C-alpha cells in the first residue's frame, strides 16, 4: 500500500548486485503488480512507472549481464507491458 517504495527497492537490487557478482534476480508473478495497467495514466500513484525506469536504465545500458541476470515470471503473455514486447527489452522466451 506504500506508494514510492517500489522504486527504491528495485534500485537497491542492482546496487547490491554489483557488490556480490554471479547472482540471479528472479521475479515471481509480475502480473500481480502488473507491467501495464490503467492506474498509471488515470491513477495518481507512481509505482510501476518509476519501476520500469529503474529496470530498463540500470540493467541494460551500463551494466554487463554476464554476472547479473534478471528473470521474470507470468501467466498470460499478452497482458504484460507492451514496452517490453518491443525489440531490445525481452528476447529469450
Amino acid at each position: 500500500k506504500y506508494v514510492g517504495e517500489g522504486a527504491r527497492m528495485v534500485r537497491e537490487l542492482f546496487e547490491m548486485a554489483r557488490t556480490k557478482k554471479a547472482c540471479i534476480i528472479f521475479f515471481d508473478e509480475i502480473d500481480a503488480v502488473g507491467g501495464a495497467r490503467f492506474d498509471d495514466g488515470a491513477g495518481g500513484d507512481n509505482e510501476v512507472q518509476r519501476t520500469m525506469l529503474e529496470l530498463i536504465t540500470q540493467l541494460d545500458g551500463f551494466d554487463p549481464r554476464g554476472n547479473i541476470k534478471v528473470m521474470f515470471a507470468t501467466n498470460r503473455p499478452n497482458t504484460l507491458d507492451p514496452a517490453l514486447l518491443r525489440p531490445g527489452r525481452i528476447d529469450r522466451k
Binding site: 506504500y2 506508494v3 514510492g4 495518481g44 500513484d45 507512481n46
Partner: protein, 61 residues
C-alpha cells in the same frame, strides 16, 4: 524512518529559507529558483519530504 505525510502548519519565513511544501490537497506549494541541496536540515528538518508527488528540484531527502 518511513514517513508518508510531509506537511507543515502555518510556517512563513523569509523570501529565502521558507519552503514548507504541503502534500495535502489544501494549500499546495512549490519551490523554484535553481537547485538547493542540504545535508541534513533543509528548512524545518524532520517532516521534510516528497513521497508520491515529486515537487520540483529536490531529490536528496
Amino acid at each position: 524512518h518511513p514517513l508518508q505525510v510531509a506537511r507543515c502548519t502555518k510556517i512563513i519565513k523569509g523570501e529565502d529559507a521558507k519552503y514548507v511544501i504541503n502534500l495535502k490537497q489544501i494549500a499546495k506549494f512549490v519551490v523554484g529558483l535553481g537547485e538547493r541541496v542540504s545535508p541534513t536540515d533543509i528548512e524545518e528538518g524532520m517532516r521534510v519530504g516528497v513521497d508520491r508527488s515529486k515537487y520540483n528540484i529536490e531529490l536528496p531527502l
